[PDB]
Amino acid sequence: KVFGRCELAAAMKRHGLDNYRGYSLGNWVCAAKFESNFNTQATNRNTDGSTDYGILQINSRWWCNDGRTPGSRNLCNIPCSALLSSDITASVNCAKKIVSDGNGMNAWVAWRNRCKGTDVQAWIRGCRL
C-alpha cells in the first residue's frame, strides 16, 4: 500500500503516534514520506546484510528479524515481513519500540535528514485526522 499522507496521518494517529514520546504526528508522517514514500512494501536491502522494511524503513539488524541479518536483535520481536504489512500497526509498534529503546526519531535517517528542522506539520496539514 502506498498511503496518502493524510491517510497515513490518520492511521498513525489512531495508533497513538501523535506526540508519542513528544514527536508530533507530522514527524511520523514525514518520516514515512521520506523513508518509504508511504509505501508499506518498501524495502531497502542494504549492503550491510540488513534491510530496511516498510513504511518506516525499520532496519533488520536491531529491530525485526528477517532471519538473514547479522547481529539480529529483533528488538521489536517481529519478523521484518510484518513491517511490510499494509496495515501499519507492526511498523508503528516497532517504531514505538525504537523510540522506547532510547532512540529519538533520529533513528530514522530520512527523518533526521528530511523531517528534522522542517515544517513536518505540512505532512498533516489539510488532513482529516
From Swiss-Prot:
InterPro entries: Glyco_hydro_22, Glyco_hydro_22_CS, Glyco_hydro_22_lys, Lysozyme-like_dom_sf. One of its GO terms (cellular component) is endoplasmic reticulum. Transmembrane segments: none annotated. Pfam families: Lys (PF00062). In the egg white and polymorphonuclear leukocytes. The keyword Endoplasmic reticulum does not apply. Disulfide bonds join C6-C127, C30-C115, C64-C80, C76-C94. SUPFAM superfamilies: Lysozyme-like. The active site is at E35, D52. It is an enzyme of class 3 (hydrolase). GO terms for biological process: cell wall macromolecule catabolic process; defense response to bacterium; defense response to Gram-negative bacterium; defense response to Gram-positive bacterium; killing of cells of another organism. Substrate binds at D101. It is found in: Secreted. Residues 1-129 form the C-type lysozyme domain. Keywords: Allergen, Antimicrobial, Bacteriolytic enzyme, Disulfide bond, Glycosidase, Hydrolase, Secreted, Signal. Its EC number is 3.2.1.17. GO terms for molecular function: beta-N-acetylglucosaminidase activity; identical protein binding; lysozyme activity. It catalyses: Hydrolysis of (1->4)-beta-linkages between N-acetylmuramic acid and N-acetyl-D-glucosamine residues in a peptidoglycan and between N-acetyl-D-glucosamine residues in chitodextrins. Lysozyme C is capable of both hydrolysis and transglycosylation; it also shows a slight esterase activity. It acts rapidly on both peptide-substituted and unsubstituted peptidoglycan, and slowly on chitin oligosaccharides. Belongs to the glycosyl hydrolase 22 family. Monomer. Lysozymes have primarily a bacteriolytic function; those in tissues and body fluids are associated with the monocyte-macrophage system and enhance the activity of immunoagents. Has bacteriolytic activity against M.luteus. This is Lysozyme C. It comes from Gallus gallus (Chicken).
